[PDB]
Each structure stands twice: as structure tokens, then as C-alpha cells.
Design a protein around this ligand. Structure first.
Ligand SMILES: [Zn+2]
Length: 36
């Protein structure tokens, strides 16, 4: 809820999407930022 979370997730601080692994969250964060 608005006052606090429950359970556990690998949460994106950039868009607010929630993931089931740090590997899945990392594979998602490549879409926000990458080297070039
Ligand atoms: Zn994200």
C-alpha cells in the first residue's frame, strides 16, 4: 500500500517495475541505461 510494501521483490527505482530475480532486474535496467 501507499504507507509501505509487503513480501519481497527486485524493484526498479527508475520506472517502478517489480521482478523475481536481480538477474531479471539487471536485464531490464539495460533498457534504461547502457554504454555507447
Ligand atoms: Zn525499470
Amino acid at each position: 500500500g501507499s504507507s509501505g510494501s509487503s513480501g519481497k521483490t527486485h524493484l526498479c527505482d527508475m520506472c517502478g517495475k517489480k521482478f523475481k530475480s536481480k538477474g531479471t532486474l539487471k536485464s531490464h535496467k539495460l533498457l534504461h541505461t547502457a554504454d555507447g
